[PDB]
Amino acid sequence: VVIGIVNNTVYDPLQPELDSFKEELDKYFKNHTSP
Amino acid sequence: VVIGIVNNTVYDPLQPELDSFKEELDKYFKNHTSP
Amino acid sequence: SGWTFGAGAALQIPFAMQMAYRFNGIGVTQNVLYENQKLIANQFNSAIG
Ligand SMILES: *[C@@H]1O[C@H](CO)[C@@H](O[C@@H]2O[C@H](CO)[C@@H](O[C@@H]3O[C@H](CO)[C@@H](O)[C@H](O)[C@@H]3O)[C@H](O)[C@H]2NC(C)=O)[C@H](O)[C@H]1NC(C)=O
Numbered sequence A, B: 001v002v003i004g005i006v007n008n009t010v011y012d013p014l015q016p017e018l019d020s021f022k023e024e025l026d027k028y029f030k031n032h033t034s035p
Numbered sequence C: 001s002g003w004t005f006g007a008g009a010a011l012q013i014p015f016a017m018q019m020a021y022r023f024n025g026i027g028v029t030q031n032v033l034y035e036n037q038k039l040i041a042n043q044f045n046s047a048i049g
């Protein structure tokens, strides 16, 4: 309904706070899954 | 660059809303890697 | 140029967007204008006549 809107992406402030943490959790997950 | 700036620790509530969970998430991993 | 031509160099700005600032001074968020631009415009053209 908004006339003239455009396309881009919005970065979650928590996204780096989880891309460095969920991946850190994932890295911690990788620390036990492989063996 | 700013004149008169002083040092101190900025308590970021983003940390206790993760650190307390880090006290739980890493506790889970500690509870998961120990056995 | 909105209302910035009375305090220096005039700076252009689209009219449909300028009114969104005037609402923001009243106390209503700007999302009420874009979602009702057609209704508001039809409600302003008729009034001036
Ligand atoms: C911004 O990006 C979005 C996608 O992230 C664009 O929405 C997409 O627009 C195209 C229009 O070419 C849609 O294709 C249409 O598909 C229908 C079938 O569902 C077909 O009948 C139409 O003829 C047309 O091909 C596409 O579906 C739509 N994406 C989604 C998820 O619905 C949007 O257009 C972009 N905006 C700008 C300003 O570029």
Ligand SMILES: *[C@@H]1O[C@H](CO)[C@@H](O[C@@H]2O[C@H](CO)[C@@H](O)[C@H](O)[C@H]2NC(C)=O)[C@H](O)[C@H]1NC(C)=O
Pocket: B006, B007
């Ligand atoms: C604020 O903290 C900074 C960071 O430690 C201080 O900068 C350092 O100060 C020490 C002296 O204690 C110097 O040896 C370092 O060379 C400084 N580092 C840099 C990059 O300059 C700063 O002095 C502190 N200021 C106050 C007022 O406490």
Ligand SMILES: *[C@@H]1O[C@H](CO)[C@@H](O)[C@H](O)[C@H]1NC(C)=O
Pocket: A031, B033
């Ligand atoms: C993987 O876990 C061990 C203990 O199980 C720990 O000592 C090690 O630091 C962990 N790996 C990383 C990259 O932190």
Ligand SMILES: *[C@@H]1O[C@H](CO)[C@@H](O)[C@H](O)[C@H]1NC(C)=O
Pocket: B031
């Ligand atoms: C550790 O894990 C076991 C099951 O794997 C669970 O029963 C126990 O409550 C856990 N301990 C803590 C402190 O969460």
